Amino acid sequence: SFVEMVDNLRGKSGQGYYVEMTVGSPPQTLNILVDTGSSNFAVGAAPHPFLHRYYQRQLSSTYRDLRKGVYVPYTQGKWEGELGTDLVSIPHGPNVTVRANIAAITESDKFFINGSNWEGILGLAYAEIARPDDSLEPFFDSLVKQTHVPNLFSLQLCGAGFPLNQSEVLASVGGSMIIGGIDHSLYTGSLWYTPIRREWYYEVIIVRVEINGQDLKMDCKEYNYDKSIVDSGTTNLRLPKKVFEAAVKSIKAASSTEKFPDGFWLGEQLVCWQAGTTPWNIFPVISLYLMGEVTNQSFRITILPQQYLRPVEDVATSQDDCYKFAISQSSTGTVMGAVIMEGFYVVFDRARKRIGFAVSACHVHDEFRTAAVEGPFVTLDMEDCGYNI
């Protein structure tokens, strides 16, 4: 049942978590990135240096065609291709097969990643943000319409933290995507849900931020200007320009004893410490409060620095441990990326227009602190925190 979907994702925050799927009759196996930050199902359909395989449209008995092109632009990366449909399957997912819209990517810039080990992308967000337009039923919509698979999914993403190599991205277990349900063995404590403000991105509303127990005291709108989303396909936690400066100040200050290249805080440069020397305790926790399910009720998730200091391999290719700053600046709203998701079991309860958080079974723990999901809290005028035009 759901056991068979446990551990069905591979990858890392920096390059994406992917799932295995087949497409076409006869079936063609492909690794697909799992993206809650977009709407389109797309796959390589023509050679590319970073692609170890691709979708041959002309070998599927079942490939239909729409003779309609598509362009999809992301914050970074973009692709162009031809629209058709085909039968699709998830070996380590539910036992069903659906005919779903599929973009065959013909041309692309900055979208496929060197030795990422995926060749496609699965946009799980809602039709409203699908290209060329909504009419284009995203995959999950198809799956729910054509089958008895319930309308929700869960994502438990894990980051292993000794920089992962390409022979380790195959070997590592990055996580689990439970289709059509919640697997209770994969989290502890209880689930806290925040409503999905609107069904396009999975867009939530942040009502308070604290760093090591201190409120930034900003007007909430600032936290959700012009939106906050949950995006498995974005690596970093991306804050809007004011919130970002505020958080960086607080974090610099808290970590004053030590010195970092000015490009460190822009997430351009690494920092390294003697292996197992890194002074985690001088980096603060960050608590995000989310709108709850009941009037004047909030809850919070606490992010450890282990998450916002992402690991990567040395400039000398030496043992001592290195990291990139996984908090970055946004001109297009708050994005709770994979680093933020890594700690948690996240339920995308599309059916009840909500998203739940609980501490993940996976989450790595620093000695004296622990990631948490706690409530209830009281918070007034939460609707005022949503940004409108």
């Binding site: 390059q15 992301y74 989303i229 690596t235």
Partner: peptide, 4 residues
């Protein structure tokens, strides 16, 4: 690193 990846970025919608």
């Amino acid at each position: 690193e990846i970025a919608x």
